[PDB]
């Protein structure tokens, strides 16, 4: 993938909701940690970097991260880890939160410059169906699935979803973003 043109930061916040440490075994945490790192790396080279948040950040994910990265995470840019939940961190902007979920009845069609998009930070192989959908509904926050159909004909990894969002900022074309991150082959 080649990037053309001038780097212009987006005002969008993207949140990795890291509240699910207790639902994952050791391999899954290890994988998630690699995926969080890929979100930062994809953000750094993006034509429109966003502000990346990692909320409820702690526990075995935070340990693993520092074990693997050996303190390098403390050097990352446009990156905001916090023990606060997203609901805590963005209470005043609650109306602007959108939790991305494959299980939503709603479909995202554009990323709004004034909105805050949440990705569930979990590697479960989707054995926890409706998990993120349920969490956001109980909070009264809107959810949306990626407009994958009808080029998909479903549940992507944390970093795949991040990468797709970031590429949409660049191209403003979902088909191109999908073609780049999940080519049919
Ligand atoms: N088709 C899709 N549309 C929107 N978000 C998706 C998606 N596939 C994956 N995701 C995102 O990637 C994250 C990890 S995969 C999710 C597994 C979990 N069973 C769940 O309930 O969400 C999700 O939390 C969601 O934020």
Ligand 1 within 6 A of CB of 102: yes
- Mutate which of 23, 150, 161 for ligand 1 pocket (most atoms within 8 A of beta carbon): 161
Q: How far is the CA of 75 from the centre of ligand 1 (A)?
A: 28
- CA atoms of 157 and 181, how far apart (whole Å): 11
Tell me the catalytic residues: 124
Which of 116, 113, 112, 111 shows the shortest CA–CA distance to 93?
116
127 labeled part of a ligand binding site? yes
Please, which experimental method was used? Answer: X-ray
User: Tokens at residue 125, please?
Assistant: 């192989």
Sheet containing 13-17, strands listed edge to edge, beginning at the edge strand earlier in sequence:
79-81, 51-55, 13-17, 116-120, 97-100, 142-144
Select from 16, 19, 101 the residue to mutate for testing ligand 1; criterion: most ligand atoms less than 8 Å from CB: 101
Confirm if 54 and 121 have CB atoms less than 8 A apart. yes
Q: SS3 of 113, please? A: coil
Q: Domains along the chain?
A: 1-185 (3.40.1280.30)
Residue 45 token pair: 């080279």
Span from the CA of 132 to the centroid of ligand 1 (angstroms): 7
Distance 120 CA to ligand 1 centre (A): 6
100 belongs to an annotated ligand binding site: yes
**Burial (CB count within 10 angstroms: exposed 0-12, middle 13-18, buried 19+), residue 29:** buried
Q: CB of 2 within 8 A of CB of 45?
A: no
Which residue puts its alpha carbon closest to atom 18 of ligand 1? Answer: 126
Per-position DSSP letters for 66-94, written without gaps between them: HHHHTTGGGG-SSEEE-SS-HHHHTGGGG
User: Which among 131, 132, 155 has a CA at the least distance from the CA of 142?
Assistant: 132
Coil, helix or strand for 117? strand
- The answer to the question of whether 132 is labelled as a binding residue is yes
- Whether 135 lines ligand 1, by a CB cut-off of 6 Å, is no
∠ CA 129-142-181, rounded to 5°: 65
């Amino acid at each position: 993938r080649i990037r053309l043109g001038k780097v212009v930061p987006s005002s969008i916040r993207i949140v990795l909701d890291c509240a699910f440490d207790d639902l994952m075994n050791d391999k899954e945490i290890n994988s998630l940690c690699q995926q969080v790192t890929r979100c930062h790396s994809a953000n750094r080279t993006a034509l429109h970097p966003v502000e990346l948040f990692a909320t409820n950040f702690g526990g075995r994910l935070k340990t693993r991260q520092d074990f693997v990265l050996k303190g390098q995470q403390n050097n990352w840019k446009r990156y905001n880890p916090t023990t606060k939940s997203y609901l805590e961190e963005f209470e005043s902007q609650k109306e602007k939160l959108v939790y991305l979920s494959a299980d939503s009845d709603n479909t995202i069609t554009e990323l709004d410059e004034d909105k805050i998009y949440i990705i569930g930070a979990i590697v479960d192989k989707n054995r926890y169906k409706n998990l993120c959908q349920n969490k956001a509904s109980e909070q009264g926050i809107k959810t949306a699935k990626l407009p994958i159909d009808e080029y998909i004909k479903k549940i992507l990894t944390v970093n795949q979803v991040f990468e797709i969002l970031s590429l949409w900022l660049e191209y403003r074309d979902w088909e191109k973003a999908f073609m780049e991150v999940i080519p049919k082959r």
